[PDB]
Design an enzyme around this catalytic site. Structure first.
Site, mmCIF file in Angstrom:
data_model
loop_
_atom_site.group_PDB
_atom_site.id
_atom_site.type_symbol
_atom_site.label_atom_id
_atom_site.label_comp_id
_atom_site.label_asym_id
_atom_site.label_seq_id
_atom_site.Cartn_x
_atom_site.Cartn_y
_atom_site.Cartn_z
ATOM 1 N N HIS A 83 0.867 -1.199 0.000
ATOM 2 C CA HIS A 83 0.000 0.000 0.000
ATOM 3 C C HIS A 83 0.894 1.236 0.000
ATOM 4 O O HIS A 83 2.120 1.100 -0.191
ATOM 5 C CB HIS A 83 -1.066 -0.012 1.102
ATOM 6 N N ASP A 87 6.004 2.622 5.263
ATOM 7 C CA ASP A 87 6.558 1.275 5.555
ATOM 8 C C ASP A 87 6.446 0.310 4.385
ATOM 9 O O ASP A 87 6.851 -0.873 4.475
ATOM 10 C CB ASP A 87 5.916 0.684 6.820
ATOM 11 N N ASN A 179 -3.667 3.013 13.487
ATOM 12 C CA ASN A 179 -3.898 4.110 12.566
ATOM 13 C C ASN A 179 -5.054 3.829 11.585
ATOM 14 O O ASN A 179 -4.890 3.032 10.653
ATOM 15 C CB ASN A 179 -2.626 4.377 11.784
HETATM 16 ZN ZN LIG Z 1 -0.282 1.719 6.431
#
Ligand SMILES: [Zn+2]
Length: 226
Positions: A83, A87, A179
């Site tokens: 995505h 990270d 998150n």
């Molecule tokens: Zn993420």
């Protein structure tokens, strides 16, 4: 033995063998007072390697390539980011500098651009709809629908039944969603069921952050989400 924030020396990247021709890579980033770890995957194909996700930032991704050359000694020729967050794409320019052909879905390229993040050079076509799968070298890439993010992909290594869930899947010890600023909480249960229905024989399921488990991490994720 799975690497954690308590044993990966600062700035280092570690590899962990999951199965024949499959490793996870584990890197850390300290944010405030808390050190976080992040997982990606490495998959052998003939005499080359496919990388799944960066090691969360440029410095870590340099270290990842060094660690790969030290432990495996085969060249990373392609990557897939799962995505648009740091990270997953943070360190794409490092990969590009090293001669890696970097890929992700068109939507991830767009979201990464919008976020001012690094952008893989090449689009995986035929992934735009919930439930789309494509073959890519020794893996399947599956877009199961929105969850942790609108674009999140999962990667399956069919020869050895290893599913890399990325951040669409929570580790066993995690009990809060984390998150959700880019998340689709309403969709995330359907998205998990799609993963469950597609990969019923998976033996190992690797979350984006934290310890590997098995298929039980999928329902766990739905439980955390709802
Ligand atoms: Zn993420």
């Amino acid at each position: 033995e799975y690497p954690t924030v308590d044993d990966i020396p600062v700035g280092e990247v570690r590899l962990y063998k999951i199965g024949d021709g499959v490793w996870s890579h584990i890197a850390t980033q300290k944010l405030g007072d808390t050190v976080y770890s992040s997982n990606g995957l490495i998959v052998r194909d003939a005499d080359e390697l496919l990388l799944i996700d960066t090691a969360w930032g440029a410095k870590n991704t340099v270290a990842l390539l060094a660690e790969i050359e030290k432990q495996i000694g085969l060249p990373v020729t392609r990557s897939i980011s799962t995505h648009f967050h740091d990270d997953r794409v943070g360190g794409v320019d490092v990969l590009r500098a090293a001669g890696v052909a970097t890929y992700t879905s068109p939507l991830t390229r767009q979201l990464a651009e919008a976020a001012g993040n690094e952008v893989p050079a090449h689009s995986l076509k035929a992934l735009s709809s919930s439930g789309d799968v494509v073959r890519f070298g020794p893996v399947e890439v599956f877009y199961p629908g929105a969850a942790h993010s609108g674009d999140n992909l999962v990667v399956y290594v069919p020869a050895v039944r290893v599913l890399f869930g990325g951040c669409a899947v929570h580790e066993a010890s995690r009990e809060s969603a984390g998150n959700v600023a880019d998340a689709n909480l309403a969709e995330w249960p359907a998205t998990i069921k799609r993963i469950q229905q597609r990969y019923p024989e998976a033996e190992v399921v690797i979350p984006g952050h934290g310890l590997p488990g098995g298929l039980e991490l999928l329902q766990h994720t739905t439980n955390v989400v709802k």
